[model samples]
Target: NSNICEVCNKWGRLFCCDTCPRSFHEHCHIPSVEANKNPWSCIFCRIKTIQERCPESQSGHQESEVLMRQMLPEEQLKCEFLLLKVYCDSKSCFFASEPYYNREGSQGPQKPMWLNKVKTSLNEQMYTRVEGFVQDMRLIFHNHKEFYREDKFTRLGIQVQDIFEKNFRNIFAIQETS
Candidate 1:
């Protein structure tokens, strides 16, 4: 039994996958690591057999400023899915959840954003355009980099952002928009 979580490489109460050479924290892995699942497999071990169709948006927007209009229902679905995917990919709560208290009100970053905030906003239809959602999503990590500066969390922020972008392009079916 190793001492570090395979996903973040940090120490935690890890659950070892019987089918792979990996360990993960409960909240770090998708579907989560449960105690009852006596022979659980890692996502990488099981994802190959798990597949779903990517929904298509009518306009297929890809970060164009002019095309940043109100998102259609289908487009909203894609965004919702993207957020869900990001949450599943996230390895730690530091970037995934809001601070324990109103850190913003008590000398933290102003207008701080996190994954949960983005999720609730999308659910409540607070985002008029996909660009706003995209910005807020990146803002979560940007705030982390800003708050932590050149620290371990900064690297973690970048790592989480990369996961978001990779899933974003695939879900939107965009070809090298970068």
Candidate 2:
């Protein structure tokens, strides 16, 4: 009822969104920046703005971090399920009954090329559950491919993996406003 920050909700006249509907407070922002005002419009929305203009290869921002706060358990599970399929499908080169990674490249368990690129920049706290799901899928593929077979799996695997992989990938993309 009374005046409020709309972001942190502690009651303050800090800033306003150029295109926002509800009140915002400092804590409402990601990384929860307080006493900071680079864009009065809020950096979270700015990042989404920039990311939205990106090509398909980089459009995962919409489904990943942008709506991260709004993401419910069901949505999280949905995304996780897709990521799991991605892991299982992408690593189809290997099978539990075959050589490691299903390839004779002379090694064991080759990590997803994208994963290696994202892990260092990954935010553990925010993405712990997603990461865990991804990790679990990777292990399952690496050690238990036989359980999933390949035909029916690939039929749906690629679709789910493609969706989740791209979405999850956005979580680690650059999140700064231009």
Most lDDT-accurate candidate:
1
Q: Go through the candidates in order and give each one's C-alpha lDDT.
A: 0.68, 0.41
lDDT score, residue 30, model 1? 45
Residue-level lDDT tens digits of model 1 in 1-178: 5577765668878888787777778865644466687788766555423323333332345557422857776567667667756765545466666764333423466878887777678768888888889989888877777777655656888888898888887766565643
lDDT of 2 by residue, 90-174 (tens): 3433321233344332333344334322222232333444444455444543333333355365344344444444545454442
Checking candidate 1 for backbone clashes, the offending pairs are none
State the local distance difference test value for candidate 2: 0.41
- Per-prediction TM-score to the true structure, in the order listed: 0.60, 0.27
The count of residue-pair clashes in candidate 2 stands at 11
Indicate the worst ten consecutive residues by lDDT in candidate 1.
49-58
TM-score of 2: 0.27
